[PDB]
Ligand binder design. Structure first.
Ligand SMILES: [Mg+2]
Ligand SMILES: [Mg+2]
Lengths: 127, 106, 197, 61, 122, 167
RNA sequence: UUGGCGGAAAGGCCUUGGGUGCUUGCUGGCGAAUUGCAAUGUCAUUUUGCGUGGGGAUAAAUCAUUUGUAUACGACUUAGA
RNA sequence: CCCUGAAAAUGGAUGGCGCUCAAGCGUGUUACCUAUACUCUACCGUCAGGGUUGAUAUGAUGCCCUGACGAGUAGGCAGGCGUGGAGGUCAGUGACGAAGCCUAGACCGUAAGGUCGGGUCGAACGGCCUCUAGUGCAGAUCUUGGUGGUAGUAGCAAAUA
RNA sequence: GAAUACUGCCAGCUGGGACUGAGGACUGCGACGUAAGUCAAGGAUGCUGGCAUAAUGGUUAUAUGCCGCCCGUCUUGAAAC
RNA sequence: GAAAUUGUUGAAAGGGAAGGGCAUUUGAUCAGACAUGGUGUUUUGUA
């Protein structure tokens, strides 16, 4: 039901992890650049981890798009949901994590009436 | 009869490689019978199937196929280069593989 | 082309045969090499004995048990020359080397099978006439192999049995060739001759 | 590899779109960039470049 | 936890060489076993199909004393106590059967092949 | 609000494609395919079987028949890239194949609801087959061993090199 | 099924007799479709378990005790219906 | 060309196996293998040169067209991500569950990071425009606190029992 | 008196194979046509089949082939005994 | 009620370390698209 788009390509689908985050527990795997003077990762030796750079950037016709073909838009209530009334084929709503269930049923009902896609229509639901 | 083979046997030799860096995207195939690039030019564009077995039945069969094709000749001795949809798993170095006669020009 | 290829090792050169056979195993052909005591090495017997003594000197100093093992049988000498040409320390190398078995003489699994040769490793086709060569069985029994004469006696017995086989085979094929010649020059024979058979 | 005879990726070094946040000045440079683009008179280009200038490059007259 | 303990013939039962007789641990464990059997008969269990289904030991907070070392130094002398828990259950019959339905997906060529086999044989 | 807004929304109108320049010229078949040629089916259900080629159809397919009396291959269409044109030639003049076309073979496509959990032939198709094959076999009876040749299957033996074989 | 031969890793090779099936050596009759224009289109052998129903046989080792030709402990050598 | 001249200490290195009308040496002719180099194409960014205030609807720091370029320590500059607190706004979220924490579950960004689902929990917290700083850690024989391997180890043997 | 080799040219013809399909109303340069029009001329369309689900794919563990020395620091030079 | 560190259960691998990069096999696990407006009423709750 989305707008037609070219085939979505990710140039590097693997997550860039910090060197020796597997080695030490004190080293988190959020990316940091090696500024050492003898670092094999900084010197880009063969067989080491690759580094983030601008050449891995996604296509501008394809960027910020979900695999369904929409862009995620965070919503908190019905008035935030109603902003996507004329833009249903480009944006998909996502209910925020801190919305209660008795409000979530209202947002899902209004989105189903307006034809808006919700990317998480299963949070805090009881059965 | 007793034989039903409509393909040519071949062996998966290795990947395309230098002395110390290999490239899994291109595989090297020894087709039996051919010993020169001029005879190997007949087999360009032919489909190749690697046919193997697994324990878990997926869609009615325990036999899984990996498809590819011959692209060009390699060397002076009739080895050919082959590309597959997913690359060959490199434990199949020396494994048998099937070169079909289609798409035929004869 | 074959399930198992049985190579008669007599009159072959060790390095050229090993470089043929190692590539065959790495391509996935099963090879069994028989009569390993009749391999040939180019060069004088004294040169190759000196070469083996230079190899035999090499051992680990603090413990000889973990050093290089100097195997004395001709088949194990061939196995050493072939393991030098296979990358044996990987899983692919181990899987290749388990497709090979090398024997002195021709054991009873393989005495009734067909033996082949490798013409690009044959001594009479490779060496210039006049160059000197060695016999691997003679070199191996000079450096310590104990079973040169029992292999000779077993090979004499096997050759007697094989000649008894071959006399019957020759008589049968002469009968078949006689019947084929007398049943030739018929209409089916002339049609097959026109068609090339 | 290219044997570069110049510095790659260098800015032109001439100030465009002035650093001030004055909205009326931005309206004026919008009007005069239209005039410099389409009236093919050198006066409009001269005053468009003079509109970008800083305070010490605009002495009082 | 067996490095540098002595070797014994009584590990042949378990295929080991290193075995011991931790008498205090056996006393505590068999006291807990007796208490669990008492709880089982209070609950009304069979008391003949019981096997120890669960048992675990982990570390309690240490209890520290001091040790006096040469050239006037102090070191620690710590006890490592235990938390132990165990669950005895009745040994039941075979658990279950009747696995998933495993709905099959076949192409038209596979369906034609199965129909051809069913036609061509009996 | 959780997310603020986009300052500009992209337009939802889908544009038209540009006017293409890819016309369709007809297929130029290879020279070994003339009508009446004995083919070897390389793939398919009847792979390894020798059939006779009758007519080049509209969707670049070849009309073939066994004949059905010989090897049990019915009137069918095959792909030209999945056959081998042998040098063996019979004449198919005297067969009226202009009845068959692309609409003659229709599958009557199945709905998604009709799922075959566990588990027929057109009478028009069966007397069309009976009309054509009795005209083919009269041409087959002239040269000897063609009925046996068409009944036998094709297979590669040990030592057969297809780059050296002539068909 | 009869008779041999084979110990290098024999475990296979040859042979006698009858039974039974096929024979494309030659000539006929019937069948095949629809897997829809291809999709390995599934035919091999390796190990184990559980059922049947048909044979076959009814043990030891270790701990503990003991010995001292042995021994740091294990291990070893002995004995004990 | 080969040989003598030509003697060193762990066992040993044309890289190894090995190679003798070579798989050696001199020389010539072809074919072949492959670098992040060259050619073509796509995409990302940077720089440069241009087009485009017309009406409707937005963003003129926008949109679009064309070409070239991309290594980098010390160092410089730019655009961004994250934290505590402050002004404004969303009449924002929340005991029908805020914050925190766990999660080889999902999505977005080249990345710093952001979002969602599930579990636990119990009272406050967030988006955007700005302001401010005691604002981002792997190291400093860093500071405080906690915990390992060593390890059931060294050992618990003077003063007759 | 010829041929052929060698080298070079053709805005000569033609067969097989591989990778790519960016762009998105029209505008331009052309070609074949008397014309209507058509075209391989400023970037891929037409026909058909199977599946519509973990099948493709993503993630993660393992296996295999090849590669990969421990980080930070001073230093001309660090994996550094 | 985090981490270091530990116990039990489950899964996996292991011939002198382990860990990593590219690629694929195998096992496990998982998201998305699958309605669409539509000639049409073969219609019930008659629109
Ligand atoms: Mg970490
Ligand atoms: Mg003390």
């Amino acid at each position: 039901a989305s707008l037609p788009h070219p085939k979505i390509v990710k140039k590097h689908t693997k997550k860039f992890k910090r060197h020796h985050s597997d080695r030490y527990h004190r080293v988190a795997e959020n990316w940091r650049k090696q500024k050492g003077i003898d670092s094999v990762v900084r010197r880009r030796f063969r067989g080491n981890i690759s580094q983030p750079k601008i050449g891995y950037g996604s296509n501008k016709k394809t960027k910020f798009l979900s695999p369904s073909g929409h862009k995620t838009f965070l919503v908190a209530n019905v008035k935030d949901l109603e902003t996507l009334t004329m833009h249903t084929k480009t944006y998909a709503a996502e209910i925020a994590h801190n919305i209660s269930a008795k409000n979530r049923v209202v947002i899902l009902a209004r989105a189903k009436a307006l034809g808006i896609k919700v990317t998480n229509p299963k949070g805090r639901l009881a059965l | 009869a007793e034989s039903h083979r409509l393909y040519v046997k071949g062996k998966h030799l290795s990947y395309q490689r230098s002395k110390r860096v290999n490239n899994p995207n291109v595989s090297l195939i020894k087709i039996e019978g051919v010993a020169t690039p001029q005879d190997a030019q007949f087999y360009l564009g032919k489909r190749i199937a690697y046919v193997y077995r697994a324990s878990k039945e997926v869609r009615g069969s325990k036999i899984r196929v990996m498809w590819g094709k011959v692209t060009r000749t390699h060397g002076n001795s009739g080895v050919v280069r082959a590309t597959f949809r997913n690359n060959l798993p490199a434990k199949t170095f020396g494994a048998s593989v099937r070169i079909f006669l289609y798409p035929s020009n004869i | 082309v074959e399930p198992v290829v049985v190579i008669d090792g007599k009159g072959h050169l060790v390095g050229r045969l090993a470089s043929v056979v190692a590539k065959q195993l790495l391509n996935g052909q099963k090879i069994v090499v028989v009569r390993a005591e009749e391999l040939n090495i180019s060069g004088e017997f004294f040169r190759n004995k000196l070469k083996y003594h230079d190899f035999l000197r090499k051992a680990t100093a603090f413990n000889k048990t973990r050093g290089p093992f100097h195997f004395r049988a001709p088949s194990r000498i061939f196995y050493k020359a072939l393991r030098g040409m296979v990358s044996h320390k990987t899983a692919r190398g181990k899987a290749a080397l388990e497709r090979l078995k090398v024997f002195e003489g021709i054991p009873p699994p393989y005495d009734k099978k067909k033996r082949v040769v490798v013409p690009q490793a044959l001594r009479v086709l490779r060496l210039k006439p006049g160059r000197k060569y060695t016999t691997l069985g003679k070199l191996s029994t000079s450096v310590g192999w104990k079973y040169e004469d029992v292999v000779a006696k077993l090979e004499a017995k096997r050759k007697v049995s094989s000649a008894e086989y071959y006399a019957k085979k020759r008589a049968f094929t002469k009968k078949v060739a006689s019947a084929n010649a007398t049943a030739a020059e018929s209409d089916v024979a002339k049609q097959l001759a026109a068609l090339g058979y | 590899g290219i044997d570069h005879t110049s510095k790659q990726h260098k800015r032109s070094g001439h100030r465009t779109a002035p650093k001030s946040d004055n909205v009326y000045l931005k309206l004026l440079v919008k009007l005069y960039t239209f005039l410099a683009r389409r009236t093919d008179a050198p006066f409009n280009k001269v005053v468009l470049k003079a509109l970008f200038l800083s305070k010490i490059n605009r002495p009082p007259v | 936890f067996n490095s540098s303990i002595g070797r014994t013939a009584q590990g042949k039962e378990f295929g080991v060489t290193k075995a011991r007789w931790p008498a205090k641990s056996v006393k505590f464990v068999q006291g807990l076993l007796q208490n669990a059997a008492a709880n089982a008969e209070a609950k009304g269990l069979d008391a003949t199909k019981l096997y120890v289904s669960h048992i675990q030991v982990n570390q309690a907070p240490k209890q520290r004393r001091r040790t006096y070392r040469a050239h006037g130094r102090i070191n620690k002398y710590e006890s490592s106590p235990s938390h132990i828990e165990l669950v005895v259950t009745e040994k039941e019959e075979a658990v279950a059967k009747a696995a998933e339905k495993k709905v099959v997906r076949l192409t038209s060529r596979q369906r034609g092949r199965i129909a051809a086999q069913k036609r061509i044989a009996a | 609000t959780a997310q603020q807004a986009p300052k500009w929304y992209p337009s939802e109108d889908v544009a038209a494609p540009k006017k293409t320049r890819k016309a369709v010229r007809p297929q130029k078949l290879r020279a070994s395919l003339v009508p009446g040629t004995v083919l070897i089916l390389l793939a398919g259900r009847f792979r390894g079987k020798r059939v006779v080629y009758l007519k080049h159809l509209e969707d670049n397919t070849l009309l073939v028949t066994g004949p059905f009396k010989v090897n049990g291959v019915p009137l069918r269409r095959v792909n030209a890239r999945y056959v081998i044109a042998t040098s063996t030639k019979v004449s198919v003049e005297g067969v009226n194949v202009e009845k068959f076309n692309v609409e003659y073979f229709a599958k009557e496509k199945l709905t998604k609801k009709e799922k075959k959990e566990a588990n027929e032939i057109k009478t028009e198709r069966v007397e069309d087959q009976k009309v054509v094959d009795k005209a083919l076999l009269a041409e087959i009876k002239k040269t000897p061993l063609l009925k046996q040749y068409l009944s036998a299957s094709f297979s590669l033996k040990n030592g057969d090199k297809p780059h050296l074989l002539k068909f």
